[PDB]
Amino acid sequence: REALRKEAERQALAQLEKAKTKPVAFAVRTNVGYNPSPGDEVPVQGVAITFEPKDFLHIKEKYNNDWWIGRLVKEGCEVGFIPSPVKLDSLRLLQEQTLRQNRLSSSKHGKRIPFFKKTEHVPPYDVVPSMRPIILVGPSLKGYEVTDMMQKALFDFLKHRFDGRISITRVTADISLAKRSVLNNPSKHIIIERSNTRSSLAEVQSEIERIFELARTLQLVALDADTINHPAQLSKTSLAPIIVYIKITSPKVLQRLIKSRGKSQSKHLNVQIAASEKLAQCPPEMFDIILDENQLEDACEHLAEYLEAYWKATHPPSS
């Protein structure tokens, strides 16, 4: 009875050991939190992973129908058992039923689903690249010289600073189109309209596949994505980028920089100033790192430090 179960718990603990050194099979970003409890029937008691909404998990293997093996992408965190989407759904359902059981008959009805309202189902996990692609936004719009040059200086810095550990590539499709819901069912989102779009969804899909593949061996991935000027353009995709905001805090400074480029750039001052203002209006949490340093070496050092910390989070020594 309890010897069979001491045993099958030894098989699972052996598989968990072995998983420390497997490659990352795939990564997810969660849409739900999970607090394990003993009744969850974790294959090794006490070794489920706790996580919150929007955490990142690297998955080594699917252990069985109910459990995966992997780790939170965070320094010090080691592999453990992670509930599969199936298991999370079964636990969620039990949690709703147990809520009804514990309810007080003195309670009144809940606030109603308002009639006819359409909701997209959100799965507990979204598959994301195993290394979050680094995308630069700011100080103003891409395709103008102040922004393009300042961004180029930073990727040039990264190319040498993380040589042997990084891929830097230009994205050839408008990746803002890669909405999780559109990519997951393209025929459900056909909209007949007149628009200035330049990429097909097939092209966008090939690009997303290429990005995932660059990240599979856990090298840093940086993208020159020229259509992406604002983090909201990617927040509904399953790219989960690291958004790096190059921030010129003083718009008077930006105006003078644009003017330094000559009349052919400063005739577009207004559009560039407006874009810079929009980034400055953004809640700071839509950025992963804000570089507001006025020296290139200083902005570089800050970004490199962040990326070294991200390297540590993605490459544990037990790997």
Binding site: E145, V146, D148, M149, M150, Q151, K152, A153, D156, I248, S250, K252, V253, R256, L257, S260, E293, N294, Q295, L296, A299
Partner: peptide
């Protein structure tokens, strides 16, 4: 004084992006 320093630093940054 900060404007002047910002301009000098960011102008240098731009050149390095050439």
């Amino acid at each position: 004084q900060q404007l002047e320093e910002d301009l000098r630093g960011y102008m240098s940054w731009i050149t390095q992006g050439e």
